[PDB]
Amino acid sequence: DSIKKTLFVVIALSLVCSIIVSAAAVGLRDKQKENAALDKQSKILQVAGIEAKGSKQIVELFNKSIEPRLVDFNTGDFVEGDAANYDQRKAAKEASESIKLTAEQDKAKIQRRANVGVVYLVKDGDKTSKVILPVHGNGLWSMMYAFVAVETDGNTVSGLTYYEQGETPGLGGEVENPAWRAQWVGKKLFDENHKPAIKIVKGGAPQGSEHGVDGLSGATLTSNGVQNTFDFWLGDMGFGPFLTKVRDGGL
């Protein structure tokens, strides 16, 4: 009869399609995760200043030189956990691990804080030479993410890279310009009193300045976004305690 035949044919089609789909999905999951890990590690190495081309090269160099770690923002001290596979964005999104910021503290307009951060130590030999701090904040059109590599004295920036901005190309997207990113090398994050001193100077910073950086031409709103990002994260509410610990030495 009809109903039995239609049920049978639907049964068969569903079984075949489900088997194929499940096999394909489960087979490739590890390779997809590997691709994502490679995508992150490439940017981390590029910020660290280690030359690397190819999947094998990236993997071997990241395993050899980098050491992810977890940091508790409240006390700026390390904690134990799965640092390599941590997901700070998801931690911020969730309600248990993360907190709501207040309008007084939310300088960068991020509106939530993960409460446990991940930082990457760059190692040559047994010692440590740099620490790479992921920072992010709101620009004009979208949320902007970047890595800042600071030397082991806790004051001198070794490099900066914006890897997800989404601003307007050519006007606000110049944060990704190599000529602009090259200005950060050698600048000092803190003054003699140990407070934030990075300033995005509108109209260009004075030549030879130890704290100023040229602002983006015609993109003062994105410059303000960057300034707010660094004001929040360099402050005592963000990475300030951990940076004081780093400056104390023994990293």
Q: Which residue stretch of 22-30, 102-110, 158-166, 214-222 sits at the interface with ligand FMN (rule: CB under 6 A)?
A: 214-222
Of positions 79, 171, 182, 185, contacts other proteins by CB under 8 A = 171
Residues between 101 and 140 with contacts to ligand FMN, criterion CB under 6 A: 140
Burial of 203 (0-12, 13-18, 19+ CB in 10 A): exposed
User: 92, 88, 70: which is closest to 79 by C-alpha?
Assistant: 70
Using CB under 5 A as the binding rule, whether residue 92 contacts Ca ion is answered as: yes
Residue 222 binding: pick among other proteins, Ca ion, ligand FMN, none (C-beta 5-8 Å cut-off by kind): ligand FMN
Residue 2 binding: pick among ligand FMN, other proteins, Ca ion, none (C-beta 5-8 Å cut-off by kind): other proteins
* C-beta closer to ligand FMN: residue 24 or 179: 179
Beta-ladder partners of 112? 100
Phi-psi region of 190 (alpha: psi -120 to 50; beta: other; left: phi over 0): beta
Phi then psi for residue 24, to 5 deg, are -60, -45
Burial of 70 (0-12, 13-18, 19+ CB in 10 A): middle
Residues between 151 and 180 with contacts to ligand FMN, criterion CB under 6 A: 167-168, 171-172
Of positions 186, 210, 218, 236, contacts other proteins by CB under 8 A = 218
- In whole angstroms, how close is the CB of 134 to other proteins at the nearest point? 18
Q: d(Cα 224, Cα 140) in Å, to the nearest integer?
A: 9
Residue 92 binding: pick among ligand FMN, Ca ion, other proteins, none (C-beta 5-8 Å cut-off by kind): Ca ion
Residues between 47 and 86 with contacts to other proteins, criterion CB under 8 A: none
Q: d(Cα 182, Cα 190) in Å, to the nearest integer?
A: 19
* C-beta closer to Ca ion: residue 92 or 219: 92
Residue with tokens 């307007």: 168
Residue 155 binding: pick among other proteins, Ca ion, ligand FMN, none (C-beta 5-8 Å cut-off by kind): none
Q: d(Cα 124, Cα 130) in Å, to the nearest integer?
A: 10
Both structure tokens of 67: 């050491």
* C-beta closer to other proteins: residue 123 or 202: 202
Residues binding ligand FMN (CB under 6 A):
140-141, 167-168, 171-172, 218-222
